[PDB]
Design a protein around this ligand. Sequence first.
Ligand SMILES: Nc1ncnc2c1ncn2[C@@H]1O[C@H](COP(=O)(O)OP(=O)(O)O)[C@@H](O)[C@H]1O
Ligand SMILES: Nc1ncnc2c1ncn2[C@@H]1O[C@H](COP(=O)(O)OP(=O)(O)O)[C@@H](O)[C@H]1O
Lengths: 396, 396
Amino acid sequence: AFEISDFKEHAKKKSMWAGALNKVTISGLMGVFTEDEDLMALPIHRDHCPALLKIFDEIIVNATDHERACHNKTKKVTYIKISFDKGVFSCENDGPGIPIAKHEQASLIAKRDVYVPEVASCHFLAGTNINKAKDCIKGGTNGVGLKLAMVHSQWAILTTADGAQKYVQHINQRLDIIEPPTITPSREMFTRIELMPVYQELGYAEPLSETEQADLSAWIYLRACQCAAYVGKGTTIYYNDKPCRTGSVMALAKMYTLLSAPNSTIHTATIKADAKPYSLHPLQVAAVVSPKFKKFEHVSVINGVNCVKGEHVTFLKKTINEMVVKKFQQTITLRDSCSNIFIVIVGSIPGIEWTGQRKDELSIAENVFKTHYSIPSSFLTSMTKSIVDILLQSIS
Amino acid sequence: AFEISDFKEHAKKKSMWAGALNKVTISGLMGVFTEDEDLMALPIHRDHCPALLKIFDEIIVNATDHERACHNKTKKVTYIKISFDKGVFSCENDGPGIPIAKHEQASLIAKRDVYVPEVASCHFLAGTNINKAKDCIKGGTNGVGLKLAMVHSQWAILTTADGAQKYVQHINQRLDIIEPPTITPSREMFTRIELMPVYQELGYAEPLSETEQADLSAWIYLRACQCAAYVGKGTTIYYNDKPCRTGSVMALAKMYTLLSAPNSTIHTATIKADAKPYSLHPLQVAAVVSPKFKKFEHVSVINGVNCVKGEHVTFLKKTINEMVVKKFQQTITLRDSCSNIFIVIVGSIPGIEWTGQRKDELSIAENVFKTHYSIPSSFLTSMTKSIVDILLQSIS
Ligand SMILES: Nc1ncnc2c1ncn2[C@@H]1O[C@H](COP(=O)(O)OP(=O)(O)O)[C@@H](O)[C@H]1O
Ligand SMILES: Nc1ncnc2c1ncn2[C@@H]1O[C@H](COP(=O)(O)OP(=O)(O)O)[C@@H](O)[C@H]1O
């Protein structure tokens, strides 16, 4: 009755690692769909497997982490190329590869030669963020993300090149089969992850049905677009070799409001702080205010992660509400004030935590914002004007 | 740069296991405070450490799981006794103890004698729920909760008795020191966990400040009260030897609305399903509708867990909204409809998953509810009456 699991078997069975391991209703699930030349972010009203979307997310975030790590180095990440076709998922970045070197600790443990990329891909609780600096703005921390991808893959190929050498390793059958790597001379420099998920075990058809394929493609496309607003100005994001043309919070904002409120006004702000480390990390905001928005809604990309809850949002909500209360009273709750707002927040916040491995919710003291950050008054004033206009109509 | 962690060190560093490992703002944090003979559930507007509250929760849920496991057995759980004093936390339940027996697998691994309760308390990814039945309604699943308690304890004592024997083991210094157990003859039968958290490392004063102590006590008290509404009718919950007098969703409802809306009307429902396993697990609901409630709010206790998000809520929201739309239109969005509702939902739901180890959000297909459950019409009608009254006032 009292059983002992290993990581591998536990990760295949337990929702704690990446969420539900079958299809469920995911609140606010969205994808990108192409209408003509327009990108449109649209709700996907079908159940999907959270753990499946997470494995994609884990590799995408590994790539955006490498971009942040290299942005102030000589050798940079210039591209992240994400592909999805015939059920196969791939993510490729340039910049320095994963070190092609024996890992001593790992080699002693396994009583054989294990190289760093094998530890990166097959060893649980392992990576370069195990001792994360209080100021680190990478999403990486747990040393788990890539191994979960592997464990939810029927086959996987890791390829990395360090400018001197190339390293190819096959990991198959949910991490049960770790093939010895193939190492050859090379002057290329990149890292590619390629895999086929265990769709059947995760509640999908094999191969994917038409709707499953279209939903997943739309979802991944939108994550790529979110990634492209986050990443530094020297990096291009591709989805199936097409550049993602959403390098700004404005572009995201329009894409999410194209159907609901086209030809609308976009309030913008860069939210800054005076003290390091916060002062290194401005937050870009775009917001739309429309009477045909039903409730408050936000899209957050923080430290490369598409989280759905955090005090960063609350900070904007309350600040806006305070002003909207005043200006309304003069002219004539936190929900009344904000139910017509759709807002996009993109940037880095150092020293945050999370509520789980999935990073759906960031964890922080509200007072970080009160103490350190100010929202430009022009943005507050603009938003208050538009909100109050709408409040004066319904009354009238 | 590429480090390998063990569970122990990882759990002390990483928010994925139990949430933030320092004080942060916790949305909707509440405690129970005594005003005269009245219990009052009140907001705690100070930052607290989520991981700290979780370790309490993990042991409390282990006890409520044992109550569910034994409720249809001959030897039952008749009490759960929760204590908090001088910083020391304890939880004691009767009913069958944890087996006082050598664990063979664990003994081979450690190359010595390890008994089951040591595996229960010190071995990660281990327990009786590793292979959880599709119909299991226990919160337990990960085989991690008790080990996290231990890892966040400067000292801990596990005591269990199986009617023939008693077993006492000390686990100290964040699970670094596992003392050999003391086994003696006994005819008692129970399990007690007693521990002192590492408050300093989690961002509290040592000892606790006045406000820290009062906040934590209020929080634990309220979790005990939540536990008492959940547990079977043969079980009494105690907090510091005082019975928690909240054995019904009505009592919870009043306790949460005593300050905001005393002497108010409580709409009640038992939500049932025709098909097993759902039909075994009725959901008890109490709701209050008041104009001086600012937004929609719920309190959920599901499978013994105080989760803050799930489709169970959404099911009630939408069903209520549909009716409120109709009845309003006749007389003359999902937010308008529901912003005056405060609702309590308590019961078991089989075969759910979660978004993380913390179990803040349950994961399920919305269609489970549409397919299997019906909300009694009298309750829907009552709620619609009260909601529409309030909608006709603001207009007027
Ligand atoms: N695309 C990549 N480029 C460079 N290094 C990578 C890449 N993907 C993964 N890594 C390395 O592999 C380690 C293990 O990855 P993962 O298990 O996802 O852990 P983490 O929590 O650090 O993201 C990372 O910490 C990083 O050092
Ligand atoms: N109070 C208790 N009474 C009986 N058994 C218990 C109790 N607390 C813990 N256990 C046992 O110890 C195991 C390990 O506990 P834990 O690590 O919390 O795992 P789980 O995820 O199963 O709750 C449980 O699965 C259960 O079998």
